[PDB]
Structures are given as C-alpha cells and as structure tokens.
C-alpha cells in the first residue's frame, strides 16, 4: 500500500546527501537510512566496529559483516513499515540501498575476491534467500534510483566525508563496485533470484557534478519518475 | 495446539538413540532431528563441512557455525509445525536440542573460551533474540527431557559412534558442556531472556547405563511425564 523506492549507488556517491533533500520535498515521503553508524559501534538493540574489522581483514570478517549488515537493514526497513507512514496519503518510502545491493553487489564482490570461501558464500545465500522468503514480499521495490558517479569521483567524496574506515579504500575496490552497479542498474545484465527486479523501473541520475547545481534538475526527475509509478 | 518437548543432552549422550524409540511408542509423536549431516556437507536448500571447520579452528568458525547451526534448527523445527501432525489427535512434537542449547550451552561456552570476541558474541545474541522475537512464540517448549550422562560416558560413546569430526573432541570440552547442562537443567541456575523456561517442566533421565536395559524404565517415565503436561 506504500510505494517503496530504493536509492542505489557507489560508496560516497551521494546517497545520504540526496536523502536529506527528500523529506522537504513532500510530507508524504519517508527515508530509511543505511544503519552505517550502528555497524561502527556494535551494540545490542562503546563496543566493536565490524565495518572496520571487515575493511581491515575482509577474508576474516566479510561473512560476519554481510550477515549482520543485511539483517540490520531489513529490521530498519521493516520498522519503518509500521510508522506514521501508514496514516499518510501518498506514502512513498525510500530505502538507502537494499538487500539486493548487499548480496549482488558487496557480498557478491567480496566472494569473487576470495574474501569468503564457498562455505561462507553458500551459507550467506541460503540465509539471504530464506530472509526474503520470510519478511520479503512486503519489501519489494516499486522503483530504483541509481545515483551514478565515476569511481574516481567516489574516491574523492570519500576523502571529503572523512569517515576513517573508508579512508583506506582503494580506487580498485570502487571500480569493482562500479561495474557491478552498471551491470545491474545500467546494462541490466545481472541475474538474481528475485524476478520482479528485472522489470522494476529505474531512474539514473548522473551525480558526478556539483550537488549545488544539479539539485533543481534532480528534484524534477524524481517527482517525474515517481508519478510514473 | 501441539505439545512440543525438547530433548537435551551432551554430545553423544544418546539423543538420536532415544529419538528412534519414540515414534514407535505412539503414532501421535513427531521428531525433528538435529540437522547434523547438513552441517557436514553445506549445500543450499558435495560441499563444505562447517562442523569440522569449527572443531578445527573455533575462534575462526564458531560464529559462522553458531549462525548457521541455529537458523538451520529453527527451519527444521518450523517445517515440522506444518506437517501431518496438525491432523493428529494428541500430537506431541519432539525437538533434538533447542535454540536454547545453541545459545546458552554451545555458543555461550565457545565465547567463554575466547572463541568468539565481543563483536561476534554481541552480533550472535542480537540475531538470536530477534529470531525468537519473530518465529519464536510458536516454538515454546511445554517440557524438557534432560538425557543425563557423565562427560566420561560421553567421550566413550563418541568413540563408538565414529563421527570423524568428533573423534578429536577432548574430555575437557565435554566437561564444560556438562556443567552447563547441569546448571540449566539440574540446578536450574541458568539465566535466560526467555522467562517461561524457568517454569517449564523437566524430566531427568540417567542414561549412563546400557540402553539395552534402562529402556523399559525410560518409556514409562516418558509416557508418565508426558501425561503430566
Ligand atoms: N553531488 C555532489 N556534489 C558535490 N559534493 C557532493 C555531492 N554529493 C555528495 N557530496 C559530498 O560527499 C560527501 C557525502 O557523501 P555521502 O552522501 O555520505 O555518500 P553516500 O550517501 O553514498 O554515503 C559530503 O561531505 C558532500 O560534501
Ligand atoms: N544408553 C546407551 N547405552 C549404551 N550405548 C548407547 C546408549 N546411548 C547411546 N549409545 C551408543 O552411542 C552411540 C550414539 O550416540 P548418539 O545417540 O548419536 O548421541 P547423540 O544422540 O547425542 O548424538 C551409538 O553408537 C550407541 O551404540
Ligand atoms: N553490504 C555491504 N558490504 C560491505 Cl563490505 N560494505 C557495505 C555494505 N553496505 C554498506 N557498506 C558500507 O557502508 C559504508 C557507508 O555506505 C561504506 O563503507 C560501504 F558502502
Ligand atoms: N550449537 C552448537 N554448537 C556447536 Cl560448537 N556444536 C553443536 C551445536 N549443536 C550441535 N553441535 C554438534 O552437533 C554434533 C552432533 O550433535 C556434535 O558434534 C555437537 F553436539
Ligand atoms: Mg550512506
Ligand atoms: Mg544427534
């Protein structure tokens, strides 16, 4: 009953920045941010920083991170499907990344990088499938917004943001993630267990340019794209 | 609507053996075996053997094993709550170990053995809680059957069974698990997030003696205990 749109994009491409100009465009919109800070100080519903543990020894912590990161995002997105939004008129729910990015972009890539052995990779997909199998049907996307920026623009915006764990991120890693986004959201040549995705609508925004300027345009293309849903 | 009883006990104490004499005692009984073989050849719903990986390098694979082992047992127990049992008269569902053993016995112990750091331990409990939070209410136990045997009897029965991964298991490990079972099912001095357990009925069977003989007794005490539920 609520339109759910996922915001996809490379590390530091500008998702959180795009998310902050969303609510002010319509009282009917909701945003579920990526629980990034919660991965940095692992506490039960100051402690460990699994995001950094993974970035510092991926073949040791990729599975754990992928396991916790995804469950985490699902809970956040599910919680928001029980808020004031239910009482809204034209409720549109935004997701900062999706269970798909987690699996077909990051997890997929860490595994192709030998950072997860067959065993870890098999267990992860089995979990991931079963997750959707359960609390999945209520999270399907009506549309996707691909925030597109060159991995070179990404590597620089990372530097601007200043998050410590990400400061050691190499261009090469950003490139691999880039092509996977391109393969999934641009060329649309990515295979997944969730058939509906293949048909799901996609809005591609070139955010390589200054947000200061391209802002007015984007708002237009967003309202636009949203009406066609 | 179905009485669900959990069978608890140390490694090789005699659970599977006890499980095999159960169905023949009443057509109304069902048994959900511990997915042990499925942990030995990790395949999606010949591959990896996470059970052995964990026994050979616990500080590397305890979390993974605990994560997969528990989800696995829940699915198995949940599936059986949708079988021919629903059509039964006096349906009694048996569980070979429970999500509690997984957490308050094995996981708890691996963590006290520095085999899981705070981060892993925090993530595991957060997952474990949230799991029950979901598909939990329908798995509550009406009663527990503690199959009690000395860790020394256990170490020998392990040798009899012949499972390879377990052949390297030291008495010391069996002792630690022993006292945790004693603490939970005997002295009943174990603290858990699931309050009902504290009141749940318990049947303690001393299975240190030959199964060939103590069999007739056990059957009596089982039917007995079951009637009082
Ligand atoms: N379109 C843009 N133009 C200029 N700077 C941008 C743009 N988008 C993001 N930034 C900068 O990048 C940083 C934020 O990146 P961020 O939004 O956190 O990436 P993500 O949303 O994927 O985490 C900010 O410090 C901001 O100054
Ligand atoms: N009460 C018993 N008396 C004699 N032998 C037993 C008894 N219980 C189990 N065994 C032996 O131990 C082995 C099975 O242990 P098992 O049932 O697999 O432990 P668990 O059920 O915890 O996995 C068998 O090979 C069987 O011969
Ligand atoms: N699924 C994810 N896997 C990995 Cl290895 N990293 C992820 C995942 N989802 C988000 N992130 C990380 O979250 C941080 C903020 O987006 C970035 O370091 C990176 F994008
Ligand atoms: N939760 C469990 N954790 C660990 Cl480390 N091992 C477990 C767990 N549950 C069952 N097992 C194992 O399953 C095998 C058969 O019961 C034994 O090696 C041992 F009991
Ligand atoms: Mg972000
Ligand atoms: Mg067994």
Swiss-Prot record, chains A, B:
This is Deoxycytidine kinase. GO terms for cellular component: cytoplasm; cytosol; mitochondrion; nucleoplasm. It is found in: Nucleus. Keywords: ATP-binding, Kinase, Nucleotide-binding, Nucleus, Phosphoprotein, Transferase. Homodimer. It is an enzyme of class 2 (transferase). Phosphorylates the deoxyribonucleosides deoxycytidine, deoxyguanosine and deoxyadenosine. Has broad substrate specificity, and does not display selectivity based on the chirality of the substrate. It is also an essential enzyme for the phosphorylation of numerous nucleoside analogs widely employed as antiviral and chemotherapeutic agents. The active site is at 96 (proton acceptor). Signal peptide: none annotated. Its EC number is 2.7.1.74, 2.7.1.76, 2.7.1.113. InterPro entries: DCK/DGK, Deoxyribonucleoside_kinase, DNK_dom, P-loop_NTPase. One of its GO terms (biological process) is nucleoside phosphate biosynthetic process. ATP binds at residues 9-17, 157-161, 209-211. Transmembrane segments: none annotated. Belongs to the DCK/DGK family. It catalyses: 2'-deoxycytidine + a ribonucleoside 5'-triphosphate = dCMP + a ribonucleoside 5'-diphosphate + H(+); 2'-deoxyadenosine + ATP = dAMP + ADP + H(+); 2'-deoxyguanosine + ATP = dGMP + ADP + H(+). The keyword DNA damage does not apply. Changing residue 102 to A: Strongly increased catalytic efficiency towards deoxycytidine. Strongly increased catalytic efficiency towards deoxythymidine. The keyword Magnesium does not apply.
